[PDB]
Amino acid sequence: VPDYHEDIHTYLREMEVKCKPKVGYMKKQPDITNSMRAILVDWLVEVGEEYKLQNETLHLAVNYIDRFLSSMSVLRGKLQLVGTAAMLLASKFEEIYPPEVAEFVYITDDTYTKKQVLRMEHLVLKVLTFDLAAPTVNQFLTQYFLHQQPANCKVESLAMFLGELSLIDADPYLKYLPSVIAGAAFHLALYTVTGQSWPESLIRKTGYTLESLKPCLMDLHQTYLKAPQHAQQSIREKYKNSKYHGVSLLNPPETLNL
């Protein structure tokens, strides 16, 4: 329904800039780092896989975690708690059938009590001031998807894949807007599967070019190459599945030729 595609797309753009976390928050977190976070996000990928949650719910949670850690110091022993309430909030917001709390407590190997997950849910709700409908990479990719000729599911999945990979590493993906990560990912997928490139229509629509997308595409290209050797592997496993057309098994291109 192009009736509102444009008004929505503009709105998501207004908003992505207001829901943005602050880029250098890890430097101020005395007791945590990007690897632990990466360990947390990696772990939420399986929890999502285990409960069969949407990718969308996945992205929302990580938006919540980054925003929650932008202004609150957390002891590592509490990282998983923060991440566990973020994922229950994303679930509640996005899912038809959200997993009940007892199960969220269940997958932490009873590391935290129900009371604590509920308390932490409130704390996050307060720090985010209930601002939960944040744009994410997923929400941008679906739109860009409409610009294919013809559609190509291998490409979709591969984009999704590259987007979801970018959740893993605050550094450097925190500095890129979600709509930019999605451009980078769409182009890299497309180029990879068919060799086509960022379509002129998406230039009209978004205002981004390969030129504007280069900086983020350069990081992502590396991530795609280094993927098989990355400490974290839940996403690569996930995308081996038929459900995503086995795109994790595809060979990245050695050069983009930008």
Binding site: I32, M36, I39, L40, W43, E46, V47, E49, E50, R76, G77, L79, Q80, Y106, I107, T108, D109, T111
Partner: peptide, 10 residues
């Protein structure tokens, strides 16, 4: 399953 686990960071 693999999903459930206490995340250790120390």
């Amino acid at each position: 399953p693999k999903p459930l686990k206490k995340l250790r960071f120390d």
